[PDB]
Design an enzyme around this catalytic site. Structure first.
Site, PDB file in Angstrom:
ATOM      1  N   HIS A   1       0.829  -1.236   0.000  1.00 30.28           N
ATOM      2  CA  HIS A   1       0.000   0.000   0.000  1.00 30.28           C
ATOM      3  C   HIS A   1       0.852   1.270   0.000  1.00 30.28           C
ATOM      4  CE1 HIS A   1      -3.032  -2.980   1.215  1.00 30.28           C
ATOM      5  NE2 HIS A   1      -3.719  -2.306   0.297  1.00 30.28           N
TER       6      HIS A   1
ATOM      7  N   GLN B   1      -5.413 -18.037  -3.629  1.00 32.48           N
ATOM      8  CA  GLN B   1      -5.506 -17.262  -4.897  1.00 32.48           C
ATOM      9  C   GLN B   1      -6.695 -17.747  -5.727  1.00 32.48           C
ATOM     10  OE1 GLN B   1      -3.694 -14.458  -6.114  1.00 32.48           O
ATOM     11  NE2 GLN B   1      -2.944 -14.347  -4.039  1.00 32.48           N
TER      12      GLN B   1
HETATM   13  C1  LIG Z   1      -8.649 -14.054  -0.062  1.00 29.09           C
HETATM   14  C2  LIG Z   1      -7.350 -14.748  -0.083  1.00 29.09           C
HETATM   15  N1  LIG Z   1      -7.069 -15.843   0.737  1.00 29.09           N
HETATM   16  C3  LIG Z   1      -5.712 -16.197   0.555  1.00 29.09           C
HETATM   17  C4  LIG Z   1      -5.015 -17.183   1.297  1.00 29.09           C
HETATM   18  C5  LIG Z   1      -5.775 -18.064   2.074  1.00 29.09           C
HETATM   19  C6  LIG Z   1      -5.051 -19.027   2.808  1.00 29.09           C
HETATM   20  C7  LIG Z   1      -3.660 -19.084   2.839  1.00 29.09           C
HETATM   21  C8  LIG Z   1      -2.902 -18.164   2.079  1.00 29.09           C
HETATM   22  C9  LIG Z   1      -3.597 -17.215   1.310  1.00 29.09           C
HETATM   23  N2  LIG Z   1      -5.127 -15.403  -0.377  1.00 29.09           N
HETATM   24  C10 LIG Z   1      -6.150 -14.530  -0.826  1.00 29.09           C
HETATM   25  C11 LIG Z   1      -5.850 -13.575  -1.897  1.00 29.09           C
HETATM   26  C12 LIG Z   1      -4.911 -12.508  -1.304  1.00 29.09           C
HETATM   27  N3  LIG Z   1      -5.175 -11.244  -1.898  1.00 29.09           N
HETATM   28  C13 LIG Z   1      -6.092 -10.315  -1.361  1.00 29.09           C
HETATM   29  O1  LIG Z   1      -6.763 -10.422  -0.341  1.00 29.09           O
HETATM   30  C14 LIG Z   1      -6.081  -9.141  -2.239  1.00 29.09           C
HETATM   31  C15 LIG Z   1      -6.785  -7.951  -2.057  1.00 29.09           C
HETATM   32  C16 LIG Z   1      -6.501  -7.031  -3.077  1.00 29.09           C
HETATM   33  C17 LIG Z   1      -5.618  -7.332  -4.112  1.00 29.09           C
HETATM   34  C18 LIG Z   1      -4.929  -8.523  -4.287  1.00 29.09           C
HETATM   35  C19 LIG Z   1      -5.152  -9.415  -3.305  1.00 29.09           C
HETATM   36  C20 LIG Z   1      -4.586 -10.772  -3.090  1.00 29.09           C
HETATM   37  O2  LIG Z   1      -3.727 -11.384  -3.736  1.00 29.09           O
HETATM   38 MG   LIG Z   2      -7.363   0.781   0.332  1.00 29.29          MG
HETATM   39 ZN   LIG Z   3      -5.589   0.316  -2.962  1.00 24.46          ZN
END
Ligand SMILES: Cc1nc(-c2ccccc2)[nH]c1CCN1C(=O)c2ccccc2C1=O
Ligand SMILES: [Mg+2]
Ligand SMILES: [Zn+2]
Length: 313
Positions: free
Chosen positions: A68, A269
């Site tokens: 960020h 992902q």
């Molecule tokens: C939802 C989610 N749960 C896991 C994960 C679950 C378990 C173990 C490891 C990882 N990874 C993610 C996606 C991570 N992610 C965001 O949250 C996000 C927000 C804005 C832009 C790009 C992103 C982005 O890459």
């Molecule tokens: Mg923001």
């Molecule tokens: Zn942003």
């Protein structure tokens, strides 16, 4: 007045493309943003002296956090530029002005922590702003910078146009709270399908601008695979630091924030592309057909994460 910014040829061409990466040369980012404002908005939209001073004060109020940061601000502004340039006639003069600035300012003074961690920590910002905590802060910071002597880039708008633009920026920035995205997209989904979607209706426009903001904010998932994969490292560097800080408060973080669960990133992902990214760019492509390259790139990156899980990378 006759003083254009010009980029090198490779950048002059690639900057028009949705999947453009702004490169590792920080000192080129201000000129890339001015270039985008001049072509998107006009060379007269902003007094160049005041714009340059707004940009350098915005940059100073971004912190040295892994994700960020100032690079994200300019990356999100470039995605907005690409959307506006592929949809010339759909947006007013005030909207083109307000949205590029909204994107540049949308994460001002981010600390690398989510709304949830601010609430659990009992941070002062969580008492001042009960919902969309950081996003109300990013807008607050944007108004503060606009009111510094010599920084008011909107000075030559009428009083009503000034109020209209700050309202566009306020809503655009609140819309980057991903917690609001789910309901905004479902409302837009229903409206598009039942055929009630009306771009002359201000509350409908507001919703469409909200989704554009989510689309620009998530645009890391719309880059070429090498950019998407290296950005993921920065995203997790912040999340895992937040997870560490959760454990310091005596709270097990969600797996997304737990560096011990790194192994589950590929499946995390997949959930994210299927639950958040693909729906976002699908609804945006239905409403704004020329933004289809964003959906296409997001699907290519979903397929690359599927290859990771199948041990092919
Ligand atoms: C939802 C989610 N749960 C896991 C994960 C679950 C378990 C173990 C490891 C990882 N990874 C993610 C996606 C991570 N992610 C965001 O949250 C996000 C927000 C804005 C832009 C790009 C992103 C982005 O890459
Ligand atoms: Mg923001
Ligand atoms: Zn942003």
């Amino acid at each position: 007045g006759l003083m254009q910014f010009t980029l090198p040829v490779r950048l002059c061409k690639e900057i028009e493309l949705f999947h453009f990466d702004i490169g590792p040369f920080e000192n080129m980012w201000p000129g890339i943003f001015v270039y985008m404002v001049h072509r998107s908005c006009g060379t007269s939209c902003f007094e160049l002296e005041k714009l340059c001073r707004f940009i350098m004060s915005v940059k100073k109020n971004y912190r040295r956090v892994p994700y960020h940061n100032w690079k994200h601000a300019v990356t999100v502004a470039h995605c907005m530029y690409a959307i506006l340039q592929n949809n010339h006639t759909l947006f007013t003069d005030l909207e083109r002005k307000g949205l590029l600035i909204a994107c540049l300012c949308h994460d001002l003074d981010h600390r690398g922590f989510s709304n949830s961690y601010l609430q659990k920590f009992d941070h002062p910002l969580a008492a001042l702003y009960s919902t969309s905590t950081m996003e109300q802060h990013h807008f607050s910071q944007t108004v503060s910078i606009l009111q510094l002597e010599g920084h008011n880039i909107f000075s030559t708008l009428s009083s009503s146009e000034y109020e209209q633009v700050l309202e566009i920026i306020r809503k655009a920035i609140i819309a980057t709270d991903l917690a609001l995205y789910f309901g905004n997209r479902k409302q837009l989904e229903e409206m598009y399908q039942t055929g009630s979607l009306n771009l002359n209706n201000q509350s409908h426009r507001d919703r469409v601008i909200g989704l554009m903001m989510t689309a620009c904010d998530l645009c890391s998932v719309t880059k070429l695979w090498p950019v998407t994969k290296l950005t993921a490292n920065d995203i997790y560097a912040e999340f895992w630091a937040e997870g560490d800080e959760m454990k310091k408060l005596g709270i097990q973080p969600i797996p997304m924030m737990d560096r011990d669960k790194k192994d589950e990133v590929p499946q995390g992902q997949l959930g994210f592309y299927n639950a958040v990214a693909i729906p976002c760019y699908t609804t945006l492509t239905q409403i704004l057909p020329p933004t289809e390259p964003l959906l296409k790139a997001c699907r290519d990156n979903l397929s690359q994460w599927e290859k990771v899980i199948r041990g092919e990378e």
